[PDB]
Every structure is written in structure tokens, then in C-alpha cells.
RNA sequence: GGAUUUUUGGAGCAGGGAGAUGGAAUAGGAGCUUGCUCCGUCCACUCCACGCAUCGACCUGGUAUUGCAGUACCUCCAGGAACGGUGC
């Protein structure tokens, strides 16, 4: 059950709780996120929860994409061309993923408009100084794992590994 | 057509009207009109510095009427 | 209930000096004696004067036919 | 003659541009002779502003175009 | 003689709505009187403008000449507004 | 004197040198040739005046009612 | 006599419309109403100090249109006969 | 009634532009002056003209003036501010 | 069916003054390249008049509320002022 144009044209699309145009693509078990050109950047949020996506890549240019729900998936790697395809990506929910190393968070630093990031329920969050490395690598993010970044955490991230 | 505005409840009540260009007046309405023209007897207009100047009975047309707020409980 | 047309007719019968403010123009106003009126609020002022509040000057013109689409507020003065 | 210019875009998401430079993207449900647009669950872009059901008057309308497929 | 947005605005009288004027003034409150010419008379209204001067007044009256838009709740967008 | 309506005053002002000033600040001075019921003006040998200074002669000039602010009979 | 009947008979023609805000929209006129509601298809709009954008459809009101631009090969003498 | 008012009022100044095929100037609210021959008119001053020349002045945003020419155009009566008839075709 | 609430528009235009202040990589003219001098276009800082006052959104610290609802907005104190509009 791969993501095609007929699956995106038959999927439900409505208004979310934040008054944004969201398309519900849950319950599809798509192994790879592709063929997203049929939406023509008419959705403000993408609900791709409960899927089997392994890599968050292969997305076309969508300037209206501001929220991406990748919860309950097996995402273990992030694409390096995420900034060239989503310049206005501000919300990224990557809870309960397959990220084990902090080096997968290195392509996530290119998103300058990203402010809300969720990396909870992951083996990469259980490593030593994971939050300090995420604050040092991504200074544009203001809320990490439902927690506001303070000045002391930014000073601790800028002190170590400088 | 040509229905008059519902100004029967705001009759003989002290209200503040706003006019275009940032003008503010306060006075008691003495009548109504289908062209939204209001007659304010003993009206006082607010200047730029904040002083109130009494202009007496004035007539405000509906082409520049922005908002009328009733200062009395009707 | 006092009608605005009846008030304009009483002001034209009394021949008192009235000042008319323009729409979207607070710097310059007109002042004169309204002689007659019409359905489109067209005022005919005799020996009218344009008063500029910024420069504090007064320029007389005489018989002026002011349209009702530009006059926003009209007040009665003692002068 | 047919007057089907406004009926073909009924129940669809359209983005109308205002005179001051604002853009309201909403689902056009009904119209009138004064071009009164009723945009249910509309978004305001110029930043995103949560508005919802916005009834904009026809005097502040400039242009309107199709935004996407109907929900 | 009566429009469908005019009928939707007349049917939404008594609910917590808002009216944004052409100058940016947002009069919010319960729509007590709504005529066919977009005349909105509200009681216990609140002024939240584009200037931001938020205040509370006992009664307000905004005409349809300088009215830019109206924000209404979505309780009447289902029925009988489905055509 | 007697209350004169503006329409016979505009009908009797034809052929006399008047000056019509618009809302943009410019005025046209000339002999009033044509004046209809929609408050439109058509003059001959018109001269343009801006900020109290003459600009030039144009001839027959037609001014609508939506732009003309006032008119004074000289 | 009436310009609305002349504007309504100018369908399927590539024209341009300049608004009061400086935005020029060039496209094929497909629908004209009595209130000069110009409904065009595959238009290109250029605003003041902005980039031109191509749209599949556009609907401009009559009160917002300031000027129009017709091609030189338009039969204005034949279309004027009512 | 309407024809006599159009041939005897200010609209006759427009009617002398289409009958004798004379050139008149129209100054708009956008600080532009278009000189041309009036081909079609109406009661709402909808002027459809041919062979028009529009001149104005622009700033870089010193400024400078500019001009252009159009084969056939149509302008509504709302944006028409000033209309001047002068013997410029001869 | 162009005369006040919708469609023949009341819209257009310009951002205070000064200083031997600083820059036009590839884009001004003149004294007929380059170097220099003069004059009608910005941004950054400083001074006078942080252009002024207002309220809303917002950041730091302290502090109060533990409450079952369908919402313009919601505790208070102090500092800073990146944003919006109102009148001069």
C-alpha cells in the first residue's frame, strides 16, 4: 500500500484543532512517503501517523507545509534536502521513531523555521547529553519534547562541544 | 426597501459617535433619519490635545459615521 | 424626534452662520450662511470662507455650491 | 446569460485578496448580488490567523481564484 | 430581496460574534440587532481594534458602510445553510 | 433673502466666469457652458490653478460630480 | 449605448486589465456579467513591485478594474452594432 | 429626454469627440494623461478609445517622466477625473 | 438601475533636521577612464524632539489560582522594548 496520487485524492481532508488544513493519511501503512505532488501544497498540516515510513525524505517543494506528524513510525534517518523542500516547516512530531544516534539530527539543523520538535520515546533521547546536543545543533527550535528552552540550557549547549 | 435604522432605543440618550479622519463627538440624539443622519443636541467634540469643545446641536451624515457607542444603559 | 431635514430648513430660515467640515480632511473647513438646500444635501453658502486650522487663515470666496457628498459634519456658530 | 460563473465555484476552497493586501482562503458556500462571500474555516495570510467562519463584505473584495480541491 | 449571507447574518443574532470594520475596529459580543443593510447593534459589547484599544461598552452600533468583515461561529454553517 | 434651490442656481450660472475646485486641490476657472442634472460641468476656455498659481489654458474641460468639491461664481 | 453588452460580447479574447492598485492581469476573457464580473482562465497577474504569478482561473470585480487593454486586431466597429 | 440631455449637456462634449473624430485628453486619478480619439461612450462615461498615448511621471522609489502608446483601450468612468477637449488633431 | 450602507471609487503623494560619519562588488553624470571634487535615490549608529502618548500581542525573574468547558483577550509586580494600528 504505497502512497500514490489515487490514495491522496481519496484521503479525507478537513480543518484541524488549530484551524489549519490537515489531511488524515493515517491507517495506510505507507513504506515510503512519495507522490505528494497531487496535493499541490493545499494542506497546512500532514497527518502521517501510524505508518511504516523508514526515511523522512522524497517530498516535493511545498511552501504551505508547516506541520508534519510522523508519530508511531519507524523513521531512523532524515533527508538532507528537507530545507529545500519545506522552507516553512515549523512543527515536526517525530515521537516513537527508530532514531538511535544523534547524527540523524544533523540534517534537521537546516530547517531554520523549525521551532517545535518532538523526539520523545526514542533511543536517541536516552543517550548522554542528547538534549544539549539537540539545543546546540538546532538553535532555532524553541520547544523540544514539550519543554521550553531556557537560557541556562543554551549556555550549557554552547559551553560543551564548542 | 429603504428601511430606517433601529434607533428608537437610543433616542434621548447620551452616546459617542466616531467620524472619519479620527473625529470623536459625544451628545444626546434628538431624532433619526433613513440616510443615517443623526442630530446631536449640545454635542461636545474631542480635540487632538484632549480638550472637549462644545459645538451645540450638530448634524452628522451617514457617509462618515464609523461607530456609535451608547454611554447609557438602554 | 427632530429630523435633520427640518433642522436644515430651520437653519436656512434663521440664516445663521454654520461651519461645515469636509470628509477625510480635518485641516480645512468651510463657514457660511446656508440659503437653500436640496435632496442631495447641496448647500448654497453666501459670502463663504474657507478656514484652515493648520495655517490659521481664512480665505473668502463668496457664493459657493457645496455638495453633500463631501460635508461630513455641520455645526452652528455664533459668528 | 447563464450566470454560472459563481455557481461553478460553489462549495470549494477559494482565496480572495482584499484591498489592503490581505488574503482570506476559505470555503465559499453562498453569495448574493453584493458579492457577499461566506468563507467557512478560512485562514488569513498577509503570518497565519485563525478566523474560522468569516463573512467578508463585497466592497473590500478585489480578486478571487481557486485554491485547491473541495474537502 | 433578501440575500443568503444576509439571512445567515440575521439567523446568527444572539450569538458571540465579532465585526471587523474597515479602519480595523473589532466590535465583539452578542448580536442583538442585525438588519438587512449589515447594521450590527450589540449590547455589552467589547472594542478590540487593530489599534488594540480593548475596552468594554454597554451598547455599540456599527453600520454596514465601514464594516469590512464579520467573524461568526460555525454553529449555523451546517443547516439550513447547506445548499 | 428668498431660499433658492441649487438647481436653478446652477442653471442661471451658465455663461458666467466661475471656478470649480476639486478635492485634489486643483481648480478650473472658466465660463460655465453646460450643467446637467447629475451635477456634471462642462466649461470653455478653462484655466488650471494649483496651489494659488496658474498652470495653463486647456479650453473645453469636462468635470464630473464625483471629483468636483466646490464651485464659486466670480 | 450600453457598454455592458459590448463587454459581454468580447469573450474568448486575450486581453489585459489594470486595477487601481497597479496590478495588471492578462488573460483570456471567458465570462462577463451585467456587473462587469470578469471571469478569466489561465491568467497572469503582476502586482506592484512583485513577481508575476500564473493562475488557472481568476475572478475580478467590475469596481476594482481601472483600465482595460484590447488587441489591435479586435473588430470594434462590428461589435458596436447592437 | 436622454438623447437631448446627452446632446445638449456635458456629454455633448464627448459627442463632439466621436462625431467629428477629434482628439481629447483624459487625466486619471493615477497621475496619467491619455490623449486619444473617443470611439465609444456611454452614460456612465465608459470610454472605449483607439490610438491612445498615455504620459505620466515616476520616481525610482531625481524622478523622471515617461510615456507610452496603446492601439485600442477601454477605461471606465470611475477613474476618469478630468476630460479636456482641445483642437489638437489639426 | 453613476447622489450617504456594497458595482462607475475621497483617491493620489511624501516620510523631521544636522554632523571633516560609512558603502553602490557588476550600474550615475560633469570637470571627456583610473585618483580626486560636486550634486536631485537607502541602510547602520550618534545628537536634537530614543518622533511623541495610548492599548493589544510578546521575553525574563518572583508570585497567586488545582478550578469539568465550549471562548475577541485573561492573575499581579518590575525591567526591556523586536511587532500592530490610532491622533498630532
Swiss-Prot record, chain B:
GO terms for biological process: 7-methylguanosine cap hypermethylation; mRNA splicing, via spliceosome; RNA splicing; spliceosomal complex assembly; spliceosomal snRNP assembly; U2-type prespliceosome assembly. Core component of the spliceosomal U1, U2, U4 and U5 small nuclear ribonucleoproteins (snRNPs), the building blocks of the spliceosome. Most spliceosomal snRNPs contain a common set of Sm proteins, SNRPB, SNRPD1, SNRPD2, SNRPD3, SNRPE, SNRPF and SNRPG that assemble in a heptameric protein ring on the Sm site of the small nuclear RNA to form the core snRNP. Component of the U1 snRNP. The U1 snRNP is composed of the U1 snRNA and the 7 core Sm proteins SNRPB, SNRPD1, SNRPD2, SNRPD3, SNRPE, SNRPF and SNRPG, and at least three U1 snRNP-specific proteins SNRNP70/U1-70K, SNRPA/U1-A and SNRPC/U1-C. Plays a role in pre-mRNA splicing as a core component of the spliceosomal U1, U2, U4 and U5 small nuclear ribonucleoproteins (snRNPs), the building blocks of the spliceosome. Component of both the pre-catalytic spliceosome B complex and activated spliceosome C complexes. As a component of the minor spliceosome, involved in the splicing of U12-type introns in pre-mRNAs. As part of the U7 snRNP it is involved in histone 3'-end processing. Residues 2-74 form the Sm domain. One of its GO terms (molecular function) is RNA binding. The gene is SNRPG. Its main location: cytoplasm. PROSITE patterns: SM. The keyword RNA-binding applies.
Swiss-Prot record, chain C:
Widely expressed. In scalp skin, it is present in the hair follicle, the epidermis, and the dermis. CDD domains: Sm_E (cd01718). It comes from the Eukaryota. Keywords: Cytoplasm, Disease variant, Hypotrichosis, mRNA processing, mRNA splicing, Nucleus, Ribonucleoprotein, RNA-binding, Spliceosome. GO terms for molecular function: RNA binding. Residues 5-79 form the Sm domain. GO terms for cellular component: catalytic step 2 spliceosome; cytosol; methylosome; nucleoplasm; nucleus; pICln-Sm protein complex; precatalytic spliceosome; small nuclear ribonucleoprotein complex. GO terms for biological process: 7-methylguanosine cap hypermethylation; mRNA splicing, via spliceosome; spliceosomal complex assembly; spliceosomal snRNP assembly; U2-type prespliceosome assembly. Gene3D superfamilies: 2.30.30.100. Plays a role in pre-mRNA splicing as a core component of the spliceosomal U1, U2, U4 and U5 small nuclear ribonucleoproteins (snRNPs), the building blocks of the spliceosome. Component of both the pre-catalytic spliceosome B complex and activated spliceosome C complexes. As a component of the minor spliceosome, involved in the splicing of U12-type introns in pre-mRNAs. As part of the U7 snRNP it is involved in histone 3'-end processing. Belongs to the snRNP Sm proteins family. Patients with systemic lupus erythematosus produce antibodies which interact with snRNP proteins. This is Small nuclear ribonucleoprotein E. It comes from Homo sapiens (Human). The gene is SNRPE.
Swiss-Prot record, chain E:
Keywords: Acetylation, Cytoplasm, Methylation, mRNA processing, mRNA splicing, Nucleus, Repeat, Ribonucleoprotein, RNA-binding, Spliceosome. Methylated on arginine residues by PRMT5 and PRMT7; probable asymmetric dimethylation which is required for assembly and biogenesis of snRNPs. The keyword Ribonucleoprotein applies. GO terms for molecular function: enzyme binding; histone pre-mRNA DCP binding; RNA binding; telomerase RNA binding; U7 snRNA binding. One of its GO terms (cellular component) is U12-type spliceosomal complex. The modification N-acetylserine is found at residue 1. It is found in: Cytoplasm, Cytosol; Nucleus. GO terms for biological process: 7-methylguanosine cap hypermethylation; mRNA splicing, via spliceosome; protein methylation; RNA splicing; spliceosomal snRNP assembly; U2-type prespliceosome assembly. Residues 4-76 form the Sm domain. The keyword Transit peptide does not apply. Core component of the spliceosomal U1, U2, U4 and U5 small nuclear ribonucleoproteins (snRNPs), the building blocks of the spliceosome. Most spliceosomal snRNPs contain a common set of Sm proteins, SNRPB, SNRPD1, SNRPD2, SNRPD3, SNRPE, SNRPF and SNRPG that assemble in a heptameric protein ring on the Sm site of the small nuclear RNA to form the core snRNP. Component of the U1 snRNP. The U1 snRNP is composed of the U1 snRNA and the 7 core Sm proteins SNRPB, SNRPD1, SNRPD2, SNRPD3, SNRPE, SNRPF and SNRPG, and at least three U1 snRNP-specific proteins SNRNP70/U1-70K, SNRPA/U1-A and SNRPC/U1-C. Belongs to the snRNP core protein family.
UniProtKB/Swiss-Prot annotation, chain G:
GO terms for cellular component: catalytic step 2 spliceosome; commitment complex; cytosol; methylosome; nucleoplasm; nucleus; pICln-Sm protein complex; precatalytic spliceosome. Residues 1-80 are annotated as: Sufficient for interaction with CLNS1A. Residues 2-74 form the Sm domain. Methylated on arginine residues by PRMT5 and PRMT7; probable asymmetric dimethylation which is required for assembly and biogenesis of snRNPs. Its main location: cytoplasm. Changing residue 60 to R: Loss of interaction with CLNS1A. Keywords: Cytoplasm, Isopeptide bond, Methylation, mRNA processing, mRNA splicing, Nucleus, Repeat, Ribonucleoprotein, Spliceosome, Ubl conjugation. One of its GO terms (biological process) is U2-type prespliceosome assembly. Changing residue 58 to K: Loss of interaction with CLNS1A. It is found in: Cytoplasm, Cytosol; Nucleus. In the autoimmune disease systemic lupus erythematosus, antinuclear antibodies are developed with Sm specificity. Belongs to the snRNP core protein family. Plays a role in pre-mRNA splicing as a core component of the spliceosomal U1, U2, U4 and U5 small nuclear ribonucleoproteins (snRNPs), the building blocks of the spliceosome. Component of both the pre-catalytic spliceosome B complex and activated spliceosome C complexes. As a component of the minor spliceosome, involved in the splicing of U12-type introns in pre-mRNAs. May act as a charged protein scaffold to promote snRNP assembly or strengthen snRNP-snRNP interactions through non-specific electrostatic contacts with RNA. The gene is SNRPD1.
Amino acid at each position: 500500500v504505497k502512497l500514490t496520487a489515487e490514495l491522496i485524492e481519496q484521503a479525507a481532508q478537513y480543518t484541524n484543532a488549530v484551524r489549519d488544513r490537515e489531511l488524515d493519511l493515517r491507517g495506510y501503512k505507507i513504506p515510503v512517503i512519495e507522490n505528494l505532488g497531487a496535493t499541490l501544497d493545499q494542506f497546512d498540516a500532514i497527518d502521517f501517523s501510524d505508518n511504516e515510513i523508514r526515511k523522512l525524505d522524497g517530498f516535493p517543494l511545498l511552501r504551505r507545509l508547516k506541520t508534519l506528524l510522523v508519530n508511531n513510525n519507524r523513521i531512523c534517518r532524515i533527508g538532507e534536502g528537507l530545507d529545500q523542500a519545506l522552507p516553512c516547516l515549523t512543527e515536526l512530531i517525530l515521537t516513537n521513531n527508530s532514531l538511535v544516534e544523534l547524527g540523524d539530527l544533523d540534517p534537521l539543523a537546516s530547517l531554520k523555521s523549525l521551532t517545535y520538535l518532538s523526539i520523545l520515546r526514542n533511543p536517541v533521547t536516552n543517550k548522554k547529553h542528547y538534549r544539549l546536543y539537540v539545543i546546540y545543533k538546532v538553535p532555532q527550535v524553541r520547544v523540544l519534547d514539550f519543554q521550553k528552552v531556557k537560557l541556562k540550557e543554551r549556555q550549557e549547549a554552547e559551553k560543551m562541544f564548542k | 426597501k429603504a428601511h430606517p435604522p433601529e434607533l428608537k432605543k437610543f433616542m434621548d440618550k447620551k452616546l459617542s459617535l466616531k467620524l472619519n479622519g479620527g473625529r470623536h463627538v459625544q451628545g444626546i440624539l434628538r431624532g433619526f433619519d433613513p440616510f443615517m443622519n443623526l442630530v446631536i443636541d449640545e454635542c461636545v467634540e474631542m480635540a487632538t490635545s484632549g480638550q472637549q469643545n462644545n459645538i451645540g446641536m450638530v448634524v452628522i451624515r451617514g457617509n462618515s459615521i464609523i461607530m456609535l457607542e451608547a454611554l447609557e444603559r438602554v | 424626534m427632530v429630523q435633520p431635514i427640518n433642522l436644515i430648513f430651520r437653519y436656512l430660515q434663521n440664516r445663521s452662520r454654520i461651519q461645515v467640515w469636509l470628509y477625510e480632511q480635518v485641516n480645512m473647513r468651510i463657514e457660511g450662511c446656508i440659503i437653500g438646500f436640496d435632496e442631495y444635501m447641496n448647500l448654497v453658502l453666501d459670502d463663504a470662507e474657507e478656514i484652515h486650522s493648520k495655517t490659521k487663515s481664512r480665505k473668502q470666496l463668496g457664493r459657493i455650491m457645496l455638495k453633500g457628498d463631501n460635508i461630513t459634519l455641520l455645526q452652528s456658530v455664533s459668528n | 446569460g447563464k450566470s454560472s460563473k459563481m455557481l461553478q465555484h460553489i462549495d470549494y476552497r477559494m482565496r480572495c485578496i482584499l484591498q489592503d493586501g490581505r488574503i482570506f482562503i476559505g470555503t465559499f458556500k453562498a453569495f448574493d448580488k453584493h458579492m457577499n462571500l461566506i468563507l467557512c474555516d478560512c485562514d488569513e495570510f498577509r503570518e497565519k490567523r485563525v478566523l474560522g467562519l468569516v463573512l467578508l463584505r463585497g466592497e473590500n473584495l478585489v480578486s478571487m481564484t481557486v485554491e485547491g480541491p473541495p474537502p | 430581496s433578501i440575500g443568503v449571507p444576509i439571512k445567515v447574518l440575521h439567523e446568527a443574532e444572539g450569538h458571540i460574534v465579532t465585526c471587523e470594520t474597515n479602519t480595523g475596529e473589532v466590535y465583539r459580543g452578542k448580536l442583538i440587532e442585525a438588519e438587512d443593510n449589515m447594521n450590527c447593534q450589540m449590547s455589552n459589547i467589547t472594542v478590540t481594534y487593530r489599534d488594540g484599544r480593548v475596552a468594554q461598552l454597554e451598547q455599540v452600533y456599527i453600520r454596514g458602510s465601514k464594516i469590512r468583515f464579520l467573524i461568526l461561529p460555525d454553529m449555523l454553517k451546517n443547516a439550513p445553510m447547506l445548499k | 433673502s428668498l431660499p433658492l434651490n441649487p438647481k436653478p442656481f446652477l442653471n442661471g450660472l451658465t455663461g458666467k466666469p466661475v471656478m470649480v475646485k476639486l478635492k485634489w486641490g486643483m481648480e478650473y476657472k472658466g465660463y460655465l457652458v453646460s450643467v446637467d442634472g447629475y451635477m456634471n460641468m462642462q466649461l470653455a476656455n478653462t484655466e488650471e490653478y494649483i496651489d494659488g498659481a496658474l498652470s495653463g489654458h486647456l479650453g473645453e474641460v469636462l468635470i464630473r460630480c464625483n471629483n468636483v468639491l466646490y464651485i464659486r461664481g466670480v | 449605448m450600453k457598454l455592458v453588452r459590448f463587454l459581454m460580447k468580447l469573450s474568448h479574447e486575450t486581453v489585459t486589465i489594470e486595477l487601481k492598485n497597479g496590478t495588471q492581469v492578462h488573460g483570456t476573457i471567458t465570462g462577463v456579467d451585467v456587473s462587469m464580473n470578469t471571469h478569466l482562465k489561465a491568467v497572469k497577474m503582476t502586482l506592484k513591485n512583485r513577481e508575476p504569478v500564473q493562475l488557472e482561473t481568476l475572478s475580478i470585480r467590475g469596481n476594482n478594474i481601472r483600465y482595460f487593454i484590447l488587441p489591435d486586431s479586435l473588430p470594434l466597429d462590428t461589435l458596436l452594432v447592437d | 429626454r436622454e438623447e437631448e440631455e446627452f446632446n445638449t449637456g456635458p456629454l455633448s462634449v464627448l459627442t463632439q469627440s466621436v462625431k467629428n473624430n477629434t482628439q481629447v485628453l483624459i487625466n486619471c486619478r493615477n497621475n496619467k494623461k491619455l490623449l486619444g480619439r473617443v470611439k465609444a461612450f456611454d452614460r456612465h462615461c465608459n470610454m472605449v478609445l483607439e490610438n491612445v498615448k498615455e504620459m505620466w511621471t515616476e520616481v525610482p522609489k531625481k524622478p523622471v517622466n515617461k510615456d507610452r502608446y496603446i492601439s485600442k483601450m477601454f477605461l471606465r468612468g470611475d477613474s476618469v477625473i478630468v476630460v479636456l477637449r482641445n483642437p489638437l488633431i489639426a
